[PDB]
Design a protein around this ligand. Sequence first.
Ligand SMILES: N[C@@H](CCC(=O)O)C(=O)O
Ligand SMILES: [Mg+2]
Length: 672
Amino acid sequence: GLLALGTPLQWFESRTYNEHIRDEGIEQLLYIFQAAGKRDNDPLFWGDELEYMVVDFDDKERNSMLDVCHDKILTELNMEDSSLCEANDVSFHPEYGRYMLEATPASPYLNYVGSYVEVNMQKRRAIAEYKLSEYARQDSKNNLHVGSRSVPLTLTVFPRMGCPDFINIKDPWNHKNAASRSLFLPDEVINRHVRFPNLTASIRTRRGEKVCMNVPMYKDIATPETDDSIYDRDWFLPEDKEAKLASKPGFIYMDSMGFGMGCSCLQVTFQAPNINKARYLYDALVNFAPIMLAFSAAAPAFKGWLADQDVRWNVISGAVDDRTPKERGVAPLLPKYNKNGFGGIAKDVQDKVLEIPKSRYSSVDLFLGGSKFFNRTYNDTNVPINEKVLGRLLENDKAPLDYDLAKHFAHLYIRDPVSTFEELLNQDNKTSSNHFENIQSTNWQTLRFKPPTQQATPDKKDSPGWRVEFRPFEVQLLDFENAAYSVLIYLIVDSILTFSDNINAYIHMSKVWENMKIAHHRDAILFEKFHWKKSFRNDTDVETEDYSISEIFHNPENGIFPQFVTPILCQKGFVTKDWKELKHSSKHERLYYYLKLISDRASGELPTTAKFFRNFVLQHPDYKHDSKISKSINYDLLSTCDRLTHLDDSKGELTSFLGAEIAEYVKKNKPS
Ligand SMILES: N[C@@H](CCC(=O)O)C(=O)O
Ligand SMILES: [Mg+2]
């Protein structure tokens, strides 16, 4: 679908309704509980969500840019070509990046759908490429974008984001970019739908400084000691003076929402039988998040530099971090502009300002609890709450909540609304959840616990029920990879829901947070160790030990395969003893290859996309042993990505990346 129209309020105009919007959304939330709290027997409908970047290959000039000129694709697919999509069970939606596409099946998968996830993904991609070939035919007749070739790629990060000639607009600095005020990103990187520039601007005003994300640079023999792309400018005060103060030697400096929300991910949403099972499943998935982030790593480069990290998470986390220096317990970089460190927080509410340990884009803060294995002591970290909100969810006449659930929402409500339309200030709280969604939707976490709407009363069997979103996966290039990882989490979820009486997955939150940091290290999948539960089938107990990703996938006692994957496959009747017997199955062979791909990457036998990309840059004939990705290296890298995406092994690249056996398999067997 397309995003709804309206007049967004800029920060100074909107902050005055902060409390109003929180209040009314809490009431909307209570009506949701009142109406849908007792749903039961909801089927396991689920679905994935992919994001694409449209890349413009200028082959004559050996430059591949982000394509910011074909964004109409999203309106046409939702308008005169919607029937194409519907007939094909796909649906397209806007994302932060003007060059991005997001797409989902049009109807949820129901239980195990085998190769269909992959089939459906391929249809999404086929239709995007179809639209792009259409434009290429028009552009030709109108003599436009000559020499250009546009391809949607499922990249996590565009390696040259914010670097010279990275977008296909000739001279984008011939005007100012007043939304981000970035040194590197023209606001053309932002989707045209007013919501996105409004959010960019609001967060930067509220913060009173630009978002700042310093990523450790890979330190090769000739790597500069500072990010030599930083420059002085005089368009914007204070923002043009922040880089000198905010950057750090040995770190890539980024200063714009686009560097993070302009990155892509794979996300998968699951419907649980009821709220209680949804709380159980959410909690059980908490420590899978950092493990899967490390596992699926696909981001080893930012803003033209090789990084000493392999995932995007911390960059997106900083990219929307609306915390004032006061909330961050640090001084403003420029006290003359950022008055007292309170950024754009209204004076008359500065006395309510809390110190907040984490960005509103950050890993789950709290177990929801409410299940037999839960104990509140597992919530052992610093998690500020909105007491007023806690009070009201505890004591109200519509749906009084248990303390642990109330605490979850109360933490979500420490944040201000950062994107609000005028037309919406007043709602019918009985039927609308827009105010709740204001806050729900701008707490971006490794998982998301998703209430239905007020309309979703137990009698309505097809309404979405209580759902859990799994949000940490990096997006991979091939639809076979993304389907592999979507089916992985599906089997894990079905396993958790099927064996809910016997699986205790609780561990201390502090350990999860620690895992989230470890998950970023370069080559973490290959050697790092992570806190992981010693056993899952054990009352009361919450002992962890430190296990490699390979042990975490394969250990008989606590491994993903022996404790989640194989047991659900046995019980569904796909195997008797072991997932590997799928190799010889007539109906389940592709599933064998999905799981083999997963097993071989978890054990280090096959590279992550991040490792493949990094090898590529390091072995490139034009590489200058200084961590820099040049237009030339970027071009060739993305050309390889294009061939990989299309299973083109003419240069042996697919064999090099998937290994021969998998490569031969996918080259010779379509999903069906
Ligand atoms: N593109 C963001 C996700 C933002 C969203 O879709 O809510 C990511 O890489 O995680
Ligand atoms: Mg998205």
